[PDB]
Ligand SMILES: Nc1nc2c(ncn2[C@@H]2O[C@H](COP(=O)(O)OP(=O)(O)OP(O)(O)=S)[C@@H](O)[C@H]2O)c(=O)[nH]1
């Protein structure tokens with residue numbers, strides 16, 4: 001019966017709600033509602049311990065910047081997200097999310113999470129990306145960004161593939177439990 | 180309406196709440212109706228609970244001063260929420276809880292409110308959505 005609070009942040013449309021929902025309900029948001037404020041809950045077993053994770057979902061749209069301070073107050077772990085089909089979303093990690101998270105949640109551990117790991121090899125994406133001298137984000141890059149911002153760890157996953165999802169939240173819970 | 184008349188005359192007369200935009204809200208604005216009222220607990224930032232009369236009209240939070248009511252004065256926050264600026268949500272953690280957000284551009288505020296029962300929380304959430 002241990003309680004911890006996890007907050008997810010990142011650019012709009014980078015897959016945060018899908019990751020939370022897929023993890024908390026195994027379902028998958030079909031009708032895509034941009035987020036304003038939501039919270040969910042899930043129970044996770046880690047290293048023998050039962051933990052109840054409160055999952056605070058936030059807006060990626062900058063139009064809602066002023067509401068996000070309302071999710072930070074008692075955070076045990078941050079999932080700081082970008083999307084692998086959007087090297088833009090990655091460059092916003094140091095520019096926007098890391099400065100805000102460090103302001104509101106100093107000393108709160110951060111998991112840097114690359115979402116949509118499946119689309120790394122989808123031509124639709126990988127061609128549009130080529131259409132602008134771009135290409136999906138690469139693990140060395142994600143990992144370098146994680147070292148740069150001081151993250152507790154680096155993790156990659158696909159809500160749709162579902163691959164690695166579980167591993168994102170095990171790592172986050174290990175960080176939450178960390179003194 | 181009857182209940183509303185008495186609540187009103189029970190409200191202490193010099194009482195007001197500061198809004199984030201620097202305006203004020205005083206009992207006089209209540210002279211200009213009451214949809215439902217109920218006793219709840221307001222969780223402060225430090226995890227303390229404040230006993231509160233919540234009135235859905237906007238949302239208004241009252242504290243008791245013996246047989247008088249005053250506009251709540253909890254952690255420098257406004258005790259009145261405009262319904263047009265209101266975001267309302269279930270506390271996933273707490274079947275009795277709801278989160279009530281004033282999204283005011285002068286400075287948003289969170290209010291985490293706990294009722295006595297799951298049924299009463301869903302009762303509050305239904306009545307709040309209509310407005
Ligand atoms: N292929 C693939 N698509 C995904 C994946 N995750 C999310 N998507 C899709 O991308 C869109 C955005 O996902 P969503 O989870 O709603 O983003 P968000 O980060 O919550 O966006 P916001 O609320 O800040 S505006 C959705 O329509 C969703 O189905 C994924 O892992 N793989």
Ligand SMILES: [Mg+2]
Nearest residue numbers: 016017034035
């Ligand atoms: Mg979302």
